[PDB]
Design a protein around this ligand. Sequence first.
Ligand code: NI
Ligand code: NI
Lengths: 139, 134
Amino acid sequence: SIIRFSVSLQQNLLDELDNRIIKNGYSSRSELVRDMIREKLVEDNWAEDNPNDESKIAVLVVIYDGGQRELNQRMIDIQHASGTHVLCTTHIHMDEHNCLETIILQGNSFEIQRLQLEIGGLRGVKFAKLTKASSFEYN
Amino acid sequence: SIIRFSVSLQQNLLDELDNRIIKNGYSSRSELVRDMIREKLVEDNWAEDNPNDESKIAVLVVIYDGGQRELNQRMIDIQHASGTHVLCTTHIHMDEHNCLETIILQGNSFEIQRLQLEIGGLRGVKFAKLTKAS
Ligand code: NI
Ligand code: NI
């Protein structure tokens, strides 16, 4: 249940990929490609069909100035308006002007990606990255 | 010239690859993977960056089979053994079988990479996706 298949490609592309792995942490080529395939297949899945589907899972990671007035509440307001469901939030108080949150979200692809974009655009948000999951990965 | 190299995919990923080939009009697994590689190579800065000794904050998102006996213990063993400083780990249940955990941690590129790969390799772990800051 862990299959091998061969990929054909011109030696120049393989080396291009190999050159790029020399400066990369990636333990191995197969591992890099496997993870690229996963990432791309998830992206493709998130790009399609129904806005009726309210069942994608994702995690939004944010670093922001929790000392800034209105900022936390603006994030809450945006999440409330998005239609997404927050399953759980973990918050670390890093210092006077930095908080890290991991926000576990469920909802449709649109609602979730829009939440990331809106939050990432706020003054005082220093970092906002979404981790996507697709059902083929866990069902 | 034309070379072949081998790729090892879990069955669930391979089935999705096959479905995507059909949905998007590709002619072979080789063609789709080749095109994926071209797109990746277009990007300048990959996630595994250029590793160094600087401390960074990171988040690992893990989905795993909660019904796999002793799997959580294996994850605890890895996290306690890690050279990283794990700040906290939060678990929820997604459905009857799958659980999702987030691990918030601090460490260098090498230490964070080791943690991700070790957890990702466990039977019952569906994936371990890394987010690094700085
Ligand atoms: Ni805080
Ligand atoms: Ni349980």
